[PDB]
Amino acid sequence: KLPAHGCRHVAIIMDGNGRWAKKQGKIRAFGHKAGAKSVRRAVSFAANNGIEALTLYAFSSENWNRPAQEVSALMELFVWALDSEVKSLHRHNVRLRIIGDTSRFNSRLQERIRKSEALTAGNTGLTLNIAANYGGRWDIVQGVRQLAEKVQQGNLQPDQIDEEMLNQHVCMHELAPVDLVIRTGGEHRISNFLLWQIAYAELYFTDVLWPDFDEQDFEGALNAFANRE
Amino acid sequence: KLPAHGCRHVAIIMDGNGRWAKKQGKIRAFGHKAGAKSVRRAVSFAANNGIEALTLYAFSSENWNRPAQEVSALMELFVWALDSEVKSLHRHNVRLRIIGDTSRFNSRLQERIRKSEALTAGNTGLTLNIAANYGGRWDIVQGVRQLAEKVQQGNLQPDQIDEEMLNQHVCMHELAPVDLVIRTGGEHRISNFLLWQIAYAELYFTDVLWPDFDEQDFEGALNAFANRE
């Protein structure tokens, strides 16, 4: 089963949860919880359609400025998702990775992440990347610091640093490159998501809100990609 | 006269010249020449509508693999544009900058670029950035090399490198951030253009081909931006 319409790595900006809840007179957190159901659905769709990697923008590094309470509810939802879906991810041969600066998360959450990555580390099917406390510029900077060290250590000359070398130091360099970025919610921006990695990616924007994003919507983005002529 | 709909810095991926010429039974070079007329028109529109900076993707660093003859014709068109439009740019108070690796261009062209930037260096109206032999990853790497040197020199510690610091070392860091990216030609990709810089930019894609892009088209992208809600 070759990647749906030949799409290897899909990345998604899951926006629109607040508006989806507000339209119904409910608070944003209600929308974030329904967004977790769309996550389940997108993950299943990707793993059943030969996609090699699915990368989800779950918590931008700029979301720390949102209402204290909304942030806490997000962190509890993350904990809850780890506790509740990891066994199924494992049974489905999905390898779980969290990308972003996890050092900023609480203990309980950091431990669950490390435990969930360990358990699925040897899985060979879909790789599911959850971008949490992630930013594209931060990602590039982490790689830059890694090369800066080598320079400090005398193991690398400034004139030796090139694109390929930094590329081997940004997140997900071990996976196929991002082929398609999908952003739900109607906004036409990348909002600091995978900047280095989306250099040659198709970009697909839909007004559909994340909680309503379903299998037909995902197939539509795949068809859009297949016709990327 | 405040930036059209409050848009300070517009960047454009001027695609579609080959298809525009082919539709008429003509060769790509014919389309590139007509694209130069659309450049004149976009520049005039930006300078007359309070835009602070207009950045045009004129020659990607990956276009070196195009047909030898098409590449040469592009280089002659660049030379020709410098020779022919610089006096008017100057009279219009436009500051000209070329971003990208100019060391790879021929002598005549390198000299004309340096001369044209010098003549307009003290202009204060629109800043026109022509991205020639430019790539977004290359741009970030040039900044990384600048910081790597400082590390080599013992003037900087790896742990001191952060986003703001690298930001002060990528192209156009002295100008307002890119607010809007327009890509003509129908493809929905960024194709290695301003990656670091487009983190928070609105992205506007149109099927209109670059040679046909006119003032009404540009106003439409501006209206799209104004309604970026």
Ligand SMILES: CC(C)=CCC/C(C)=C/CC/C(C)=C/CSP(=O)(O)OP(=O)(O)O
């Ligand atoms: C289980 C798991 C790992 C993830 C699922 C939880 C979700 C959906 C996370 C993304 C939430 C954020 C910060 C969304 C942008 S929606 P928004 O709050 O910006 O909504 P809005 O733009 O106001 O309409």
Ligand SMILES: CC(C)=CCC/C(C)=C/CC/C(C)=C/CSP(=O)(O)OP(=O)(O)O
């Ligand atoms: C005066 C000046 C500084 C610039 C104007 C010259 C132009 C229009 C330069 C951009 C040309 C390129 C490499 C365009 C993509 S069009 P394409 O050739 O990819 O066409 P296609 O995709 O095949 O339809």
Ligand SMILES: [Mg+2]
């Ligand atoms: Mg949002």
Ligand SMILES: [Mg+2]
């Ligand atoms: Mg093209």
